[PDB]
RNA sequence: ACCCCUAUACCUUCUGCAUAAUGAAUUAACUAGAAAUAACUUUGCAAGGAGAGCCAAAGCUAAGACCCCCGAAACCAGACGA
RNA sequence: CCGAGCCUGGUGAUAGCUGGUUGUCCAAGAUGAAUCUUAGUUCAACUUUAAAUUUGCCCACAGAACCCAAAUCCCCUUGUAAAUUUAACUGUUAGUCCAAAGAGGAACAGCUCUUUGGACACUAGGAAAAAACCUUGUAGAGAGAGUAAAAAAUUUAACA
RNA sequence: ACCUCGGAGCAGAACCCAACCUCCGAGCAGUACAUGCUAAGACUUCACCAGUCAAAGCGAACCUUUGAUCCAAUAACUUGACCAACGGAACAAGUUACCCUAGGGAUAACAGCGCAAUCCUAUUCUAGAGUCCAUAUCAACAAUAGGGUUUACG
């Protein structure tokens, strides 16, 4: 199945957004737009929110 | 289902035999209908009831004068089974203001300016 | 039919508009009736007598 | 043994018949599949509903149908037609009513 | 709309067909030592067919057999007239380039 | 609700209404859309935008809320920096 | 009862009157031809 | 019910049982061409358009073609896709041969005929040329539909045309400030002897373009008329205003249009100079104002509407306090 | 007076009751619509009203109008009873 | 009068259930959703009152899809006078039969469902008596008159 | 067995239309991570709740179905459990002929009344049997009438 995970900005901002990734898949690192920084930055998976 | 009925146009195309039978000339057709309600609107569809109310034929056997124009004719076609239509005949022309109060509608359909 | 549909188009527009103007005037003229001092004072007559 | 089938109707269809005055953004017709195609000044949503892109009068017409070449299935369907055949579809247009603005005198410098 | 004169103006499925003595199904077998020659003759015969308006269904090939190899090709044909068949096969006979094998065998 | 309280004889307010609805003085009731904080991960951006909005109530819903609250909640409040100060009154309203 | 029935369904009296009024009326071939020369 | 079609239903002529024997659209482009043809064809149903609507010379040409074919170098350049064309020579040849027809198309598209002659058309037979001398070294030409600034059009232009009298007129089809239909003339030379223009009769002196600021883009027309025999004719807007329609009505007997050339003029500081220095009036400034956005009649209870509903109908953004 | 002609008690409950559904022998007496929020109407005063508090972007104050009767089997507390 | 005594009190228990609910007269007034819900209720629709101002219904032409009939929708005119909105609001809201298109049942049911329309729950005349078929409605008095619907029809086997 | 949602027919042509009605399907996945933010005007499953579409604008770039509130958890952004009886009691089954009350003919059984599938009777046809022989007698497939005695149905 898929799991909802919290991608946290690697830009130091407190910004986080939730994505969906397969449980068997590797931990996620993704470019995403950081509103506070106003620039695309890396986000790293921190913790699993739930299993869906 | 029961619905409004669309009357085919050929129904309202008079033939020479009809012209002879009823005494109306297709050229120079009559201007005004005299319409009387001779049938109840009860047990008839609400749309026929509404058409009768529009035409002002709530009272039966009370003649009403209407224009012989296509829209009035469309309504009259809708409710033709509840009414009697006869042309309004004016042997002395339409009444003048002087004799507007001395007219009478003869049962033949003639508005005579003397009574 | 005496007139064709195109001939009848609009021949009664003026009269119909005036009739609806009359209806609108009646509808918008609705308002409480006047009140007269005479009506109020005439009630004193309930105790009118002969002296 | 037959379950389901209790879904209600979607209340789809034309919302503005021909001649109806339509303001920008008004939905003209909602359809499940492309019964009516967007014409001039008529947009299409995700769900294939037709909405007016300008303020005007709605008109329905029949026009030759030439699909987007990237529409592979439609292109193949056309490829299988005989030489004289031309596909047709019903299109919805909004005939814009007002001009898109006027020049006004502001200051007599 | 159904009641309008323009009813059915958009129908096309009737314009799409998805599915006097005349031949049956004709198979032309071309076994040739040359891939190039076999392909060229297949193209030539197909061009003759589609120029003469002959219904051609398939132009496949048989699997190779080794016992050097001979490449095999098939041409499917349907629809011939009396004189048309004569002209067709006489042209085929006269236009065979070099050491190729024709056939007018039938299906199955 | 309680039309006559047992201690004062007054009409009571349904505090469940006060916890959920804002009354604009003119007579309008504002509310949040139900589910605006629920399972946002499976809602499209348009649906989320619709859900994040402050929404007016029906006439009958407003009448119900008016009945369920007392006149204290239907007064003019001159708060310092009320975000709804401008919305507390209607303008250019014909009938 | 359904529109189609195994028995002949009873008509509305109005329909029955309509049928009676629109019954076929044969022509009278003048004076009785057999009695004629 | 079914009303029969009011004409030949499309795809009816070719409707045959011999579909397999019928040739098909092997390609998309041929279907596109056929569809465009049908779209152009008139139809009995409602359509989008209803609502949104010598021999020796030929022999010489063939011989020239054969000569170009014979030139092998030309074939090498063609097959190496390196050959080119003389643009000036092509321009001159097109002007002589069929340039008048294209210029008539351009005039019709720009609406000169409908606004100058109420739809009465003609053909610019004479390859007229106008150019406004910019500085001293160069002169910006005035083609059919060019774009020239009033700064460059400040001074009268140099006119050249291979012909033999002529009356040249300049009008501004849309510069009028009071009446929508009238127009202003800038300069009118009459009874031109042959080609030389300095000897023309200057009836109305020259004016530069004056398109008001923010009033869009104005189209200025150079008309040239063949003149059989001279006729005596006749900085104020009241006398620069007139209608070319009735003007040329008064002279069509001995005058006939034979040349045209028009251009688009925008605002420019020279326009301010024109409005102040010599027109001696305040310059008007125009702004393109769009109609106010439509909003449905405001309801007492905007059910399900966002809080912005009230802002859609409030006029003043500043807080108000009523009696307080 | 009757004879003539016309006329299928009442209430309630029902789609529909002469109904062979309910209730009623009959007389007298007794026996069943209580009130707010907001409106509307009529006064008073009016950017203010109100005899503190409350309301107020014509409001506020006062009045007028509007919310039934009988009936379980029960439950619990405390007595009284072998 | 014991599957849990009796009395008093809580207690005017509670009852979506049954019954009852008292002067005169006039007027308007009739068949979806959710619900531990279908014996009830809330919202809608309908309905009543008052108010505002301005179009409302009827409605021809034009118009509304391919796949694979009856009609409907929409609205210039026209006949008409109503409609919308604002304020306040109860009650009715899981009906009957008839005609018609269907489904289920057995091309049974005074059977059960959906749809269009009519009538009944409202007056009168008729079809024998008669909710639902037909005629007909707006109210009173008359010891006048013209009408509407409105009454079943049929009798039949020789043979060259 | 079913209870929520959706597709097709009933329901042919705007919308809408039931069922113990005839069939089918779903409780998500794939994708990307602007699949962002805002906002005119609209649609709407006949209420509400909820659910849809969307110009313009800003910002990056150059997507195709399920469930409320409260309550919890998280600094917050956000997230969860069931609520599938799928408008959702936070947590409660069997049984009563020992039963009780309030009612219900709006709802069963006997009975009455409809209906006549079933049942019964009579004719038509002769297949046919009847040693042959249709019709002394009997009788198949059927057809047409009648009855209201069974079993059922309302
Ligand atoms: Mg369905
Ligand atoms: Mg009784
Ligand atoms: Mg009872
Ligand atoms: Mg009794
Ligand atoms: Mg003892
Ligand atoms: Mg005892
Ligand atoms: Mg009680
Ligand atoms: Mg009444
Ligand atoms: Mg529940
Ligand atoms: Mg109940
Ligand atoms: Mg809705
Ligand atoms: Mg439940
Ligand atoms: Mg439920
Ligand atoms: Zn005889």
From Swiss-Prot, chain B:
Keywords on record: Mitochondrion, Ribonucleoprotein, Ribosomal protein, Transit peptide
GO-annotated molecular function: structural constituent of ribosome
GO cellular component: mitochondrial inner membrane; mitochondrial large ribosomal subunit; mitochondrion
A Gene Ontology BP annotation from the UniProt entry: mitochondrial translation
Compartments, record wording: Mitochondrion
Domain of life: Eukaryota
Family: Belongs to the universal ribosomal protein uL30 family.
Assembly and binders: Component of the mitochondrial large ribosomal subunit (mt-LSU). Mature mammalian 55S mitochondrial ribosomes consist of a small (28S) and a large (39S) subunit. The 28S small subunit contains a 12S ribosomal RNA (12S mt-rRNA) and 30 different proteins. The 39S large subunit contains a 16S rRNA (16S mt-rRNA), a copy of mitochondrial valine transfer RNA (mt-tRNA(Val)), which plays an integral structural role, and 52 different proteins.
Name of this chain's protein: Large ribosomal subunit protein uL30m
Source organism per UniProt: Homo sapiens
Gene of this entry: MRPL30
Residues of the full protein shown: 35 to 149 of 161
Curated annotation (Swiss-Prot), chain D:
Subunit and partners: Component of the mitochondrial large ribosomal subunit (mt-LSU). Mature mammalian 55S mitochondrial ribosomes consist of a small (28S) and a large (39S) subunit. The 28S small subunit contains a 12S ribosomal RNA (12S mt-rRNA) and 30 different proteins. The 39S large subunit contains a 16S rRNA (16S mt-rRNA), a copy of mitochondrial valine transfer RNA (mt-tRNA(Val)), which plays an integral structural role, and 52 different proteins.
Transmembrane segments: none
Predominant location: mitochondrion
Full protein name: Large ribosomal subunit protein bL27m
Signal sequence residues: none
Keyword Transit peptide among UniProt keywords: yes
Family assignment from sequence similarity: Belongs to the bacterial ribosomal protein bL27 family.
Keywords, sorted A to Z: Mitochondrion, Ribonucleoprotein, Ribosomal protein, Transit peptide
This protein's GO CC annotations: mitochondrial inner membrane; mitochondrial large ribosomal subunit; mitochondrion
Organism (species): Homo sapiens (Human)
Subcellular localization: Mitochondrion
Keyword Ribosomal protein (UniProt): yes
From Swiss-Prot, chain F:
An annotated GO cellular component: mitochondrial inner membrane
Keyword Transcription regulation: no
Protein's cellular compartments: Mitochondrion
MF terms (GO), sorted A to Z: structural constituent of ribosome
A biological-process GO annotation: mitochondrial translation
Domain of life of the organism encoding this protein: Eukaryota
Transmembrane annotation, as ranges: none
Keywords: Mitochondrion, Ribonucleoprotein, Ribosomal protein, Transit peptide
Keyword Mitochondrion (UniProt): yes
Subunit: Component of the mitochondrial large ribosomal subunit (mt-LSU). Mature mammalian 55S mitochondrial ribosomes consist of a small (28S) and a large (39S) subunit. The 28S small subunit contains a 12S ribosomal RNA (12S mt-rRNA) and 30 different proteins. The 39S large subunit contains a 16S rRNA (16S mt-rRNA), a copy of mitochondrial valine transfer RNA (mt-tRNA(Val)), which plays an integral structural role, and 52 different proteins.
The family this protein is said to belong to: Belongs to the bacterial ribosomal protein bL35 family.
Protein's name according to its UniProt entry: Large ribosomal subunit protein bL35m
Species for this entry: Homo sapiens
Residues of the full protein shown: 94 to 188 of 188
From Swiss-Prot, chain H:
Annotated Pfam families: PBP (PF01161)
UniProt cross-references to InterPro entries, sorted A to Z: PEBP, PEBP-like_sf, PEBP_euk
Key words, A-Z: Coiled coil, Mitochondrion, Ribonucleoprotein, Ribosomal protein, Transit peptide
Gene Ontology BP, a term: mitochondrial translation
Cross-referenced CDD domains: PEBP_euk (cd00866)
Assembly mode: Component of the mitochondrial large ribosomal subunit (mt-LSU). Mature mammalian 55S mitochondrial ribosomes consist of a small (28S) and a large (39S) subunit. The 28S small subunit contains a 12S ribosomal RNA (12S mt-rRNA) and 30 different proteins. The 39S large subunit contains a 16S rRNA (16S mt-rRNA), a copy of mitochondrial valine transfer RNA (mt-tRNA(Val)), which plays an integral structural role, and 52 different proteins. mL38 is located at the central protuberance.
Protein name: Large ribosomal subunit protein mL38
Species this protein is from: Homo sapiens (Human)
């Amino acid at each position: 199945k898929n799991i909802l995970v919290r991608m946290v900005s690697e830009a130091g901002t407190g910004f986080c957004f939730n994505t969906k990734r397969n449980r068997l898949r590797e931990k996620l690192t993704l470019l995403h737009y950081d509103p506070v920084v106003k620039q695309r930055v890396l986000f790293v998976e921190k913790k699993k929110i739930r299993s869906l | 289902k029961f619905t409004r009925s669309r009357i085919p146009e050929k129904v309202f195309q008079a033939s020479p035999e009809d012209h002879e039978k009823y005494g109306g000339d297709p050229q120079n057709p009559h201007k005004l209908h005299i319409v009387t309600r001779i049938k109840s609107t009860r047990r008839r569809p609400y749309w026929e009831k509404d058409i009768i109310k529009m035409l002002g034929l709530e009272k039966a056997h009370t003649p009403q004068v209407h224009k012989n124009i296509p829209s009035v004719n469309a309504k009259l076609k809708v409710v033709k089974h509840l009414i009697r239509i006869k042309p309004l005949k004016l042997p002395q022309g339409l009444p003048a203001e002087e004799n507007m109060s001395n007219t009478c509608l003869k049962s033949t359909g003639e508005l005579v300016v003397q009574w | 039919p005496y007139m064709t549909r195109e001939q009848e188009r609009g021949h009664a527009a003026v009269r119909r508009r005036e009739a609806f103007e009359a209806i609108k005037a009646a509808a918008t003229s609705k308002f409480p009736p006047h009140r007269f001092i005479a009506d109020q004072l005439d009630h004193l007559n309930v105790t009118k007598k002969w002296s | 043994k037959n379950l389901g089938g209790k879904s209600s109707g979607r209340r789809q269809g034309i919302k503005k018949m021909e001649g109806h005055y339509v303001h920008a953004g008004n939905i003209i017709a909602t359809q499940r599949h492309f019964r009516w195609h967007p014409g001039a000044h008529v947009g299409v949503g995700k769900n294939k509903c037709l909405y007016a892109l300008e303020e005007g009068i709605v008109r329905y017409t029949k026009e030759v149908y030439v699909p987007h070449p990237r529409n592979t299935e439609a292109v193949d369907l056309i490829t299988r037609l005989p030489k004289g055949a031309v596909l047709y579809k019903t299109f919805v247009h909004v005939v814009p009513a007002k001009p898109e603005g006027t020049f006004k005198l502001v200051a007599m410098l | 709309y159904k009641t309008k004169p323009t009813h059915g103006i958009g129908k096309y499925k009737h314009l799409i067909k998805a599915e006097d003595y005349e031949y049956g199904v004709l198979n032309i077998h071309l076994t040739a030592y040359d891939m190039t020659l076999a392909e060229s003759y297949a193209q030539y015969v197909h061009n003759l067919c589609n120029s003469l308006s002959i219904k051609v269904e398939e132009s496949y090939a048989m699997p190779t057999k080794t016992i050097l190899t001979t490449h095999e090709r098939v041409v499917q044909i349907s629809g011939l007239s009396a004189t048309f068949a004569e002209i067709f096969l006489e042209i085929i006979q006269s236009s065979l380039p070099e050491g190729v094998r024709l056939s007018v065998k039938e299906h199955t | 609700l309680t039309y006559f309280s047992a201690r004062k004889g007054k009409r009571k307010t349904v505090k469940a209404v006060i916890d959920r609805f804002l009354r604009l003085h003119c007579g309008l009731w504002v509310r949040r859309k139900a589910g605006y904080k629920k399972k946002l991960w499976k809602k499209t951006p348009a649906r989320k935008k619709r859900l994040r909005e402050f929404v007016f109530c029906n006439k009958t819903q407003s009448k119900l809320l008016d009945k369920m609250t007392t006149s204290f909640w239907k007064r003019r409040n001159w708060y310092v920096d009320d975000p709804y100060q401008k919305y507390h009154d209607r303008t250019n309203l014909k009938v | 009862s359904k529109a189609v029935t195994r028995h002949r369904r009873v008509m509305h009296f109005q329909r029955q009157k309509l049928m009676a009024v629109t019954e076929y009326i044969p022509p009278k071939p003048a004076i009785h031809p057999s009695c004629l020369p | 019910r079914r009303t029969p079609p009011l004409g030949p239903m499309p795809n009816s002529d070719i409707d045959l049982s011999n579909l397999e024997r019928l040739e098909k659209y092997r390609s998309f482009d041929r279907y596109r061409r056929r569809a465009e043809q049908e779209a152009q064809a008139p139809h009995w149903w409602r359509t989008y358009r209803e609502y949104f609507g010598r021999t020796q010379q030929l022999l010489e040409r063939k011989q020239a073609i054969q000569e170009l074919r014979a030139n092998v170098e030309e074939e090498r350049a063609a097959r190496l896709r390196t050959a080119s064309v003389p643009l000036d020579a092509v321009r001159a040849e097109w002007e002589r041969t069929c340039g008048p027809y294209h210029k008539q198309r351009l005039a019709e598209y720009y609406g000169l005929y409908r606004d100058l002659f109420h739809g009465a058309t003609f053909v610019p037979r004479v390859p007229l040329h106008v150019a406004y001398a910019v500085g001293e070294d160069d002169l910006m030409p005035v083609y059919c539909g060019n774009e020239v600034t009033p700064t460059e059009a400040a001074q009268a232009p140099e006119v050249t045309y291979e012909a033999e009298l002529w009356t040249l007129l300049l009008t501004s089809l849309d510069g009028h400030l009071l009446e929508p239909d009238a127009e202003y003339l800038h300069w009118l030379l009459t009874n031109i002897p042959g080609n030389r223009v300095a000897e023309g009769q200057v009836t109305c002196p020259y004016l530069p373009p004056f398109p008001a600021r923010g009033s869009g883009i104005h189209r200025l027309a150079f008309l040239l008329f063949k003149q059989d025999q001279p006729i005596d004719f006749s900085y104020q807007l009241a006398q620069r205003t007139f209608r070319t329609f009735d003007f040329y009505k008064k002279h069509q007997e001995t005058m006939t249009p034979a040349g045209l050339s028009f251009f688009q003029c925008r605002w420019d500081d020279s326009v301010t100079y024109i409005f102040h220095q010599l027109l001696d009036m305040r310059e008007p400034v125009f702004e393109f104002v769009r109609p106010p956005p439509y909003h449905p009649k405001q309801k007492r209870f905007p059910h399900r509407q966002p809080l912005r509903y009230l802002d859609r109908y409030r006029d003043s953004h500043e807080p108000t306090y009523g009696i307080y």
